[PDB]
Design an enzyme around this catalytic site. Sequence first.
Site, PDB file in Angstrom:
ATOM      1  N   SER A  49      73.383  51.957  42.509  1.00 22.96           N
ATOM      2  CA  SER A  49      72.800  52.957  41.620  1.00 22.96           C
ATOM      3  C   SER A  49      72.185  54.134  42.370  1.00 22.96           C
ATOM      4  CB  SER A  49      71.730  52.330  40.747  1.00 22.96           C
ATOM      5  OG  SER A  49      70.607  52.037  41.541  1.00 22.96           O
ATOM      6  N   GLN A  50      71.827  53.977  43.634  1.00 23.70           N
ATOM      7  CA  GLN A  50      71.078  55.029  44.323  1.00 23.70           C
ATOM      8  C   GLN A  50      72.018  56.054  44.940  1.00 23.70           C
ATOM      9  OE1 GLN A  50      68.220  54.551  43.348  1.00 23.70           O
ATOM     10  NE2 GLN A  50      66.695  55.582  44.660  1.00 23.70           N
ATOM     11  N   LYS A  51      73.160  55.597  45.460  1.00 24.73           N
ATOM     12  CA  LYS A  51      74.073  56.437  46.212  1.00 24.73           C
ATOM     13  C   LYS A  51      75.500  56.187  45.754  1.00 24.73           C
ATOM     14  CE  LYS A  51      71.344  56.842  50.438  1.00 24.73           C
ATOM     15  NZ  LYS A  51      70.519  55.640  50.250  1.00 24.73           N
ATOM     16  N   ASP A 108      77.349  51.885  58.308  1.00 24.27           N
ATOM     17  CA  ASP A 108      78.365  50.856  58.420  1.00 24.27           C
ATOM     18  C   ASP A 108      78.955  50.577  57.051  1.00 24.27           C
ATOM     19  OD1 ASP A 108      78.175  50.603  61.148  1.00 24.27           O
ATOM     20  OD2 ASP A 108      76.708  48.972  61.061  1.00 24.27           O
ATOM     21  N   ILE A 126      80.488  47.945  54.643  1.00 25.27           N
ATOM     22  CA  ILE A 126      80.460  46.504  54.453  1.00 25.27           C
ATOM     23  C   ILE A 126      81.519  46.172  53.413  1.00 25.27           C
ATOM     24  CG2 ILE A 126      78.965  44.501  54.002  1.00 25.27           C
ATOM     25  CD1 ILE A 126      78.113  46.030  56.426  1.00 25.27           C
ATOM     26  N   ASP A 147      75.846  43.410  46.183  1.00 25.20           N
ATOM     27  CA  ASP A 147      74.537  44.045  46.121  1.00 25.20           C
ATOM     28  C   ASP A 147      73.517  43.014  45.641  1.00 25.20           C
ATOM     29  OD1 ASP A 147      72.268  45.449  45.261  1.00 25.20           O
ATOM     30  OD2 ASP A 147      73.509  47.213  44.609  1.00 25.20           O
ATOM     31  N   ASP A 167      60.822  49.321  49.030  1.00 24.18           N
ATOM     32  CA  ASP A 167      62.131  49.255  48.388  1.00 24.18           C
ATOM     33  C   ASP A 167      63.082  48.357  49.191  1.00 24.18           C
ATOM     34  OD1 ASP A 167      60.890  51.156  46.680  1.00 24.18           O
ATOM     35  OD2 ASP A 167      62.190  52.813  47.314  1.00 24.18           O
ATOM     36  N   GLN A 171      65.836  45.800  49.775  1.00 23.49           N
ATOM     37  CA  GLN A 171      67.035  45.342  49.070  1.00 23.49           C
ATOM     38  C   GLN A 171      68.086  44.960  50.098  1.00 23.49           C
ATOM     39  OE1 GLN A 171      68.604  48.174  46.585  1.00 23.49           O
ATOM     40  NE2 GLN A 171      66.610  48.977  45.867  1.00 23.49           N
TER      41      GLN A 171
END
Length: 175
Positions: free
Chosen positions: A16-18, A83, A85, A90, A131, A133
């Site tokens: 959701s962030q990027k 990197d 992955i 997530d 944050d 995660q």
Amino acid sequence: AFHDVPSLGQKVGAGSQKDVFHSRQDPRQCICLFRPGTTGSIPAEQYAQKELETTKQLKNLGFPVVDAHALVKHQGSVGVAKDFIHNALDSEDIVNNKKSLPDNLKFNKNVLEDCNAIIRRLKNLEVHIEDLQFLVDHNGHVLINDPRDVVRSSPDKSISKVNELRSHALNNLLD
């Protein structure tokens, strides 16, 4: 400080962030660009710089991370080169029960052990990761992803975030 990426590769993943693009410059890497509205009132360049530094601080302290390599921009988007992955899970999807850990035994052992190792390091160093995660790679290894900050503080908050994910692996291994 921010390097131009002239062309993005194929988009991948779903965070959701990027928005994450295969890197046309190194197939081991990906271009991770902030989506609208995701940096709050902090400008996106500052936010990217904070993530890169914090990733490198955590890496230096021995934590497993999604390593970050360079600050990048493409048109008006801003982010970090990281990197790549393959087939990452997530952590947010796991704990929100939008996706599940596979059944595989080795996979879940790895999630369990690596969570234990992250918790062990949080206790020893007494730091808090803002944050916090994770990404789980295709073998079940847990990688800290897009950390915002790390400070010498009570690790209880961070330990709780890790155990939240560990519980799933522990639960699988008990069944």
